[PDB]
Amino acid sequence: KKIITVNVNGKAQEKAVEPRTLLIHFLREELNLTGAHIGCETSHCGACTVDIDGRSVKSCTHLAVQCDGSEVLTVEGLANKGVLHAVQEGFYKEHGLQCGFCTPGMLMRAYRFLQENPNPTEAEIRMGMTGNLCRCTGYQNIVKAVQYAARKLQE
Amino acid sequence: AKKIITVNVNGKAQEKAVEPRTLLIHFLREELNLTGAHIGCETSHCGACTVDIDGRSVKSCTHLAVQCDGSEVLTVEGLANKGVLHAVQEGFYKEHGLQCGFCTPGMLMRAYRFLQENPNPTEAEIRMGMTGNLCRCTGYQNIVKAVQYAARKLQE
Amino acid sequence: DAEARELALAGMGASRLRKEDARFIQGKGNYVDDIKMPGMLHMDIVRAPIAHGRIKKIHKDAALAMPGVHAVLTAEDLKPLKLHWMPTLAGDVAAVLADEKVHFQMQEVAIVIADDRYIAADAVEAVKVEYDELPVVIDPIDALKPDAPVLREDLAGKTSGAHGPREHHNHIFTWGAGDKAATDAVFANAPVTVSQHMYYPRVHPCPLETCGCVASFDPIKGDLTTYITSQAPHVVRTVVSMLSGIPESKVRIVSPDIGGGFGNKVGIYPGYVCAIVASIVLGRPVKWVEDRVENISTTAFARDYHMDGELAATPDGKILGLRVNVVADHGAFDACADPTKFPAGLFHICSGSYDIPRAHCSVKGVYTNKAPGGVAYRCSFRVTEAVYLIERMVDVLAQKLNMDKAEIRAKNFIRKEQFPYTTQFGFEYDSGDYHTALKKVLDAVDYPALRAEQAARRADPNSPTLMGIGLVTFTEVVGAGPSKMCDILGVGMFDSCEIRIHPTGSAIARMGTITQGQGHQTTYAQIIATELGIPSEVIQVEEGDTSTAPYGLGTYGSRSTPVAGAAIALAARKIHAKARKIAAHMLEVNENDLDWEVDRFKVKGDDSKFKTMADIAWQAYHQPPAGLEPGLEAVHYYDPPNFTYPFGIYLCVVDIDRATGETKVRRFYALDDCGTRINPMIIEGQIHGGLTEGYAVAMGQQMPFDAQGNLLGNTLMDYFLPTAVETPHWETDHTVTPSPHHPIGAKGVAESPHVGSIPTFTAAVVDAFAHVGVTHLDMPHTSYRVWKSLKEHNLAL
Amino acid sequence: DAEARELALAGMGASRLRKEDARFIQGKGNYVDDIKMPGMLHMDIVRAPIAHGRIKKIHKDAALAMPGVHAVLTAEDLKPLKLHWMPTLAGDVAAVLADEKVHFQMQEVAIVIADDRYIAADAVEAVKVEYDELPVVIDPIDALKPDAPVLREDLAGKTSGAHGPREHHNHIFTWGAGDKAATDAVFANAPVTVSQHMYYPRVHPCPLETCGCVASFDPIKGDLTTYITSQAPHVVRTVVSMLSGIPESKVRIVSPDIGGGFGNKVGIYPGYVCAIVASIVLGRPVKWVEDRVENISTTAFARDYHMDGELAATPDGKILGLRVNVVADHGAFDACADPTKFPAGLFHICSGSYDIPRAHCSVKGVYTNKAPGGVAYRCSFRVTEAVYLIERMVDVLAQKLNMDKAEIRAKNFIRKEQFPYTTQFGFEYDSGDYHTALKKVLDAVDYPALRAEQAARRADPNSPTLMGIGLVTFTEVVGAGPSKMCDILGVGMFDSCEIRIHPTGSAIARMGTITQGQGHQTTYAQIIATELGIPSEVIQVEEGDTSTAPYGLGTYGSRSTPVAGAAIALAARKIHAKARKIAAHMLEVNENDLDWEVDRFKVKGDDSKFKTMADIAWQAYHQPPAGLEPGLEAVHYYDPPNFTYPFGIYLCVVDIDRATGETKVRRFYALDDCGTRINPMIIEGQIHGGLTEGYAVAMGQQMPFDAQGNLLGNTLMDYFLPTAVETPHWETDHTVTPSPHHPIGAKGVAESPHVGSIPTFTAAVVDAFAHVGVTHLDMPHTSYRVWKSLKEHNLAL
Ligand code: PCD
Ligand code: PCD
Ligand code: FES
Ligand code: FES
Ligand code: FES
Numbered sequence A: 001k002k003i004i005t006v007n008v009n010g011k012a013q014e015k016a017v018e019p020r021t022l023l024i025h026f027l028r029e030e031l032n033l034t035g036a037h038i039g040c041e042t043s044h045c046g047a048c049t050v051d052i053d054g055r056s057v058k059s060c061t062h063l064a065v066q067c068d069g070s071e072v073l074t075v076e077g078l079a080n081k082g083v084l085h086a087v088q089e090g091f092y093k094e095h096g097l098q099c100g101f102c103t104p105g106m107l108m109r110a111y112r113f114l115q116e117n118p119n120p121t122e123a124e125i126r127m128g129m130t131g132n133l134c135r136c137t138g139y140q141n142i143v144k145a146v147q148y149a150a151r152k153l154q155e
Numbered sequence B: 001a002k003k004i005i006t007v008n009v010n011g012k013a014q015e016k017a018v019e020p021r022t023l024l025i026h027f028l029r030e031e032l033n034l035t036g037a038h039i040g041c042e043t044s045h046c047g048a049c050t051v052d053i054d055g056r057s058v059k060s061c062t063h064l065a066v067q068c069d070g071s072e073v074l075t076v077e078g079l080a081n082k083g084v085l086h087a088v089q090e091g092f093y094k095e096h097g098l099q100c101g102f103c104t105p106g107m108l109m110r111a112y113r114f115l116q117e118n119p120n121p122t123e124a125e126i127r128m129g130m131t132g133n134l135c136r137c138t139g140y141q142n143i144v145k146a147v148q149y150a151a152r153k154l155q156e
Numbered sequence C, D: 001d002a003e004a005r006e007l008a009l010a011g012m013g014a015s016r017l018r019k020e021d022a023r024f025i026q027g028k029g030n031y032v033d034d035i036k037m038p039g040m041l042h043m044d045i046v047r048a049p050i051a052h053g054r055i056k057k058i059h060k061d062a063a064l065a066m067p068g069v070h071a072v073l074t075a076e077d078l079k080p081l082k083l084h085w086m087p088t089l090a091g092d093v094a095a096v097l098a099d100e101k102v103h104f105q106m107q108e109v110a111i112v113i114a115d116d117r118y119i120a121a122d123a124v125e126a127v128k129v130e131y132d133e134l135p136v137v138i139d140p141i142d143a144l145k146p147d148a149p150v151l152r153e154d155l156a157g158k159t160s161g162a163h164g165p166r167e168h169h170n171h172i173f174t175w176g177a178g179d180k181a182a183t184d185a186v187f188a189n190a191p192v193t194v195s196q197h198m199y200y201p202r203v204h205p206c207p208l209e210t211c212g213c214v215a216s217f218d219p220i221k222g223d224l225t226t227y228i229t230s231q232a233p234h235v236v237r238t239v240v241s242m243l244s245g246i247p248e249s250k251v252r253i254v255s256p257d258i259g260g261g262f263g264n265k266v267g268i269y270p271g272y273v274c275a276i277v278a279s280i281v282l283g284r285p286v287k288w289v290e291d292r293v294e295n296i297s298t299t300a301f302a303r304d305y306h307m308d309g310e311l312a313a314t315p316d317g318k319i320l321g322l323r324v325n326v327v328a329d330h331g332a333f334d335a336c337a338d339p340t341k342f343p344a345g346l347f348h349i350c351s352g353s354y355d356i357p358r359a360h361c362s363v364k365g366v367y368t369n370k371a372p373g374g375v376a377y378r379c380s381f382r383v384t385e386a387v388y389l390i391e392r393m394v395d396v397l398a399q400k401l402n403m404d405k406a407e408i409r410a411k412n413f414i415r416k417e418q419f420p421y422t423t424q425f426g427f428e429y430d431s432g433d434y435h436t437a438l439k440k441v442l443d444a445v446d447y448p449a450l451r452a453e454q455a456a457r458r459a460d461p462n463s464p465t466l467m468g469i470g471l472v473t474f475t476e477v478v479g480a481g482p483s484k485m486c487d488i489l490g491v492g493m494f495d496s497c498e499i500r501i502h503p504t505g506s507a508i509a510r511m512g513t514i515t516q517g518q519g520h521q522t523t524y525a526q527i528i529a530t531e532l533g534i535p536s537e538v539i540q541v542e543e544g545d546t547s548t549a550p551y552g553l554g555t556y557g558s559r560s561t562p563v564a565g566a567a568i569a570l571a572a573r574k575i576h577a578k579a580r581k582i583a584a585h586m587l588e589v590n591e592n593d594l595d596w597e598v599d600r601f602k603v604k605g606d607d608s609k610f611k612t613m614a615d616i617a618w619q620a621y622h623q624p625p626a627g628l629e630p631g632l633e634a635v636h637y638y639d640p641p642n643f644t645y646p647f648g649i650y651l652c653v654v655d656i657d658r659a660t661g662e663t664k665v666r667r668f669y670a671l672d673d674c675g676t677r678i679n680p681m682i683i684e685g686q687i688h689g690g691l692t693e694g695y696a697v698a699m700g701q702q703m704p705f706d707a708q709g710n711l712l713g714n715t716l717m718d719y720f721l722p723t724a725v726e727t728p729h730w731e732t733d734h735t736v737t738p739s740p741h742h743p744i745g746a747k748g749v750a751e752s753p754h755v756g757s758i759p760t761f762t763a764a765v766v767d768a769f770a771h772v773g774v775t776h777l778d779m780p781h782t783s784y785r786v787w788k789s790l791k792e793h794n795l796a797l
């Protein structure tokens, strides 16, 4: 086992982990940050997406041990002092979620994508959100949710 | 500073680190979630926190957890074996020795030990032997019957 | 197969074992302090060291700087939410956190929130408070003096209160019942007249589990969930909703397993309000669990009635009138649990088990520098005081006329044929048979032989012990309900039950009451078992969760059996009527060609053609007969037509040691009649507990204050509670006189042993001194006090 | 102001934001895998590596000795409890753990219980199993051959099943509907005739959240609590009680938040039973959560219908008759979700939106070495197949007659005045207005301009792309209910709702349904809001907990709005009838002198005299008018009189790349009419989702099996699921044709987009090839498969 120190949502977490432990299970099982979900074992769905060291990453294809000294942000950390982040507000206002299973991953992705590209076109949004699957929405309202967040972020 | 200790509770090793002032009752309830033992006073009279430590009945609210490093602690959760109720639990059940159940875990742990100290107790001996345990609901009458029931079951 | 099928139901009348036991005997109960939630913090309270005084300054800095402490709140943090004061069940207001001043010692002044209870307790000690002492008021009589200090400066200028006009700043109310003029007329000319002052001491219900709660406001969902030691969770939800502004549907109150309530957990304490507020502010769970000292010192006390009784009669012992005057000590704020129209509860039931043609009572409540309360500890809303008054007065009358104490009662008893009897105070006693019950007790204990033995001991001047025989014949009033008459903060005192039968025959049932150990999960199931032919073992009952249980008024005043017991039977009967309709359809016959036999509907004249409740349940889900909705369930809200009036005949023999003053209970026989009995085993337990509490009150309990207002003996070091050694062996008996208006004829009974046994003990102790002219002795009858009396009457050793 | 008050309610018709979003957007949803209980262990399953074969031996020792492993159970451990097989909704039996042999690859053979999912996975790898392979049956036709291998050795010697006689060992049933004699006669004399064979390939619902449960049997209390991904928790409870012997009242099944169901989570899977058994044995919580590969490989699949459709008509295009014959592949065990009396669901709805005088359909079920299923993925009980069949045939008929595809539909539509319309199959269509909708869609997309562009493109033999236009005009049948004909394992297909109004005006409501993302917590609140004048924001709705919610049949087949929506309105209306009665008492007028206006009862004439629902609620708790019970609540179980028949008109324009076979959806216009709309915003989301599933099914999804019966593409590596890039922008429209029999005129709609879009895609693709004589191309319309056709019809490059 390797002792690591991961900064999760602004708080330092020193834990002893087995090398094979997937980051997604470390977050869900050890820290009880159950927002991130699992929808596949092949790395396609993106329901496990979290922000690691400034980038969107599918936590099911990353080891917890690799996060020693990293900065990890999960959906539970998006709201600031209880005030929703623009992406959370956009998804809510534009009905960008139904069963809510792909939502945390979608929000974590959108959170970073909007920093990568602040004024995205619809095509760029669809392409920028390609790593995340959704079975409920048909993506249309998600595009609007991201557009709503983009406008609010430059407000 | 927290002291690292290992206390055997119900035959299982419990490795923890607690401040020296930690009362055994809070250790069991707070650290191990063995919430059977209860707190009914701050003056050591009620006995609702009674647990069996190293072969003796002890009020866990008046004993330090740090004094138990290596001890054998028995709580109500460990009386039943393989699901079968201990004679003491069966006695309280059959004789209606409990109403709200708050003093019950303490009564059971005390009766468990009492019956070993005295296998064939008279009523006076039972009332006196259970004297360190307070009950607000029963009026004790059925509790002595429950103990008499258990005493009888253990001899058969 | 009929008698066997009924027996297998383990329903009405069966002494079946408890369904609750399993979890409790294995430490799997779920009480407030067993609860642990994610992010849960702990709250402790900084309390007042003095009884009366102005708050100069509160120091928060040292406590706040301490690691582990998240917040320190005072009345200032509560003002913006209008929560530094809260409304009470008595129509007055109580301080949540002391604002400008403190009204009683140990009062809540500030709160700290910390990582755990250890740090929290440290934080309390770190908070320093500066006070300006004010003159204390501990005696009710001294409180009404012109120069007496103003306790409640918040209601300065008010000439009326929630219960009528107020004559003095420390005067709360004056309430009366009966015919004053008629009563005064009888007493003005009656040939025999007796008077007796007696004090019913302030005592505490002291449940083994103290009060506490885990308040959890979820800022994400915007709803409040608080686990609490409450005997009326639904009422608490409505009140919390209105005081907080949070829509009621988003407020969930849940009374889990409660380690005894005994009326001590009916009200809302500042501790609950503070935990809720802190939780809202911190956006996380806050746990509050008081210590024993805090429970005895600040939660609801019982009694504290200064009473002056009077009886008018003819020389043969026939009572002509009753006149009573009482001064009630309610402490700082009037938070006395009672229906809004009865500031003195049902004290006007003090005419007792006797046909008294003229009576009148008057109660005056006053403020003092003490904790709120008054109604608790199995009192049935001041019935304890009412029964004690009349029974002591009857003994006084018997002694002045030199008349036997049993004889004078049999002479004044309401005759069996007089029921339903309307008293001089307006109560309509449902049913009773006192003469038969008294004879049963007298014969059982060989009363004449007891009197003979007593006569012999009294003869020898050197008998080392005094013998006293105490006898009480009382009538209770339980089942607070008629909405036109009874309401809690505006809510009619009804109750409810909801039963749902599953496709396979078993069922789930929820009521608006809440057990604290009296066995509802077993008994309620038994009532339904008999009504529907489904074994009680598979009828799961639950109470306490405002999100699942039908709205009710909770459990106190022994109202469960009378009110909820009725709602349960009626709800079940709604299901039984539908079951018949379904059975008739399946059997292809008319409904009244059907007979109900234990657990099935069978065709008259043909035993082979029948359908069981299981058969019917399945049919209800499979294919509902035309004109019927699928399913099989019912809900019923019962507004009782009258209270229930159980009675009892209690006898106690005591032997007092002349050298030490210590009293030994030689025998105690208790006969109770609560109508139809649901579970005898459970009833017997309630009696044992009740009689034990009575012994505790009459023989050892008290809450003395010194001249400075300090509460003395507020811990188990001095506050008396008997162990198995002190508790006598109880002898119980019964008769069955059903309540005519009740769906199953069952009356409440739980409070009877407490209400009746207390004056029985006093009756026995006083009767031990009767031969030297003693008419009354104030409780507690401790060795010390009894010795002072032996000394005073030259009976010492 | 009356309009302002109605707006403030956020009730019927409003596009209000969702109440459930808050928790999900912050990761505070509560799905099965988020659950952690004290002492919870994890379970994993040893699955079959081959499609068919006998089990020689299972090696349990290596796994057992592995640190962290508590148990390894096989079918032998399940036998004593009679649980190695379980009943299915289709009346057949399914293996829980393979006993003597394995019937499909990936089938459950054994289970392991470990400390966590990591050790559990290792334990599965350590369990070795030896098999003796048997010949595999993959094609349904080869399955009926005389020499075909015996798949169900357990059914040997049987000549009948749950759905009639069986003619072969691999034959499950044969079901028909309509008039065969009449239909045969029409086809014999019809002037114009067409017939086409088409395959509706096996696909999978693949919900993002897979199936799972946390089973917890508490030996102390003797009860079972199971948190499960179930679309029908109440029937699950009833079934689990029956199979386990545990009385139903002691069984609690709870469906928490579910990450999508889509028909995949209606039935009970072997994983659930094993977890339950393991928990009973170990006396502690057992968690089972399958991986994506297990979900696709062994949970309920959809479609797999081999259809032969025929249409009889006159030269002008009027349809005279319809004849259909189907071969259905149900896998190894028939566990096809359906009402007990319909082994082929409501396939006899295949008469479509047309007034066809004579019709017949025959469906033959067959066993193969594949996972069970058939009804899932928004099928409405084989309606997906029925609509695909009829719309495809209408297209073929149009092409033969050289008649415009829209024109032949307009000419055959059931007219608005014909409703309620009884079809040749017996269904009573509630209402419709197909003509108005068709014209609306055609005008919006400028259909004639589209056909002209297509004509201009086909004229040029060098055009690099082919233009296709697909049009589908369908009629759905949703709201499975009439208990007379619809039942799940004997329970009538009704549903329920319980509403309880609190003293302060807000409310809580529970239904027998269970959302999986469709927004019931918002929409249900809106229905009640309009019915009672209480803002939807404070009407808290819950579903899924069998211990608290009224018994229902769950949500599948878009039955929620039709069945539960009716019970909700009726339960609210019972409360409204009582409120009017209470309002009349308060206003001292008669009920008939009152008028309901949005949120109050006002006296006719005098507007100033009124009482709000809030005023009425308080009065109900304060003091109920004479003859009434306290409280304000209601319950209602609705057994529907008929189904609901929403309709739609979809049009798709596609462009096919002749050099690669790539099909690009240029435009898609979807018009749905589901009657009264509760929340337009929520309906839009359902449409967007369904059209996307449609695109996935028609254009990319399939589940191919090689000769040895191994499932190919059972992970997201090959199993198609579109991303935001592949998903076209959807254009939606609607009309409002209320259901006459429904309390609020609202029809179901969630499955319509899926049912209707699939044939719209095939229509557009085939239409692109129609000019070269192509009548049909089987799905998926993959670039690979479409290119193959381009090459066959000389259109490639
Ligand atoms: N006839 C008859 C009657 C009765 N029963 C039963 O017995 C019991 C009782 O009931 P009642 O009487 O009705 O009552 P409740 O309501 O339930 O209860 C209450 C009471 O109860 C008592 N006791 C007791 N116990 C216990 N254990 N715990 C408690 O807590 C207690 N508390 C106390 C008090 S105080 Mo107050 O509140 O001051 O007013 S009131 C009171 C129940 O189970 C029942 O069912 C029978 O069986 N039968
Ligand atoms: N008119 C109308 C109708 C409707 N609505 C809405 O909408 C929704 C829906 O509804 P409906 O239609 O009734 O349906 P439901 O029942 O609810 O649902 C179910 C469906 O839904 C769908 N979608 C969905 N989504 C989501 N998100 N998730 C899911 O899971 C799902 N799933 C799917 C399916 S498949 Mo099956 O089972 O194969 O039979 S059937 C199904 C809701 O909220 C309601 O209210 C409105 O508004 N209006
Ligand atoms: S769980 Fe699917 S990409 Fe991570
Ligand atoms: S909202 Fe359900 S998968 Fe995206
Ligand atoms: S808590 Fe009272 S003796 Fe321990």
Ligand code: FES
Pocket (backbone or CB within 6 Å): B097, B098, B099, B100, B101, B102, B103, B104, B134, B135, B136, B137, B138, C208, C259, C260, C517
């Ligand atoms: S049973 Fe309640 S204190 Fe003993």
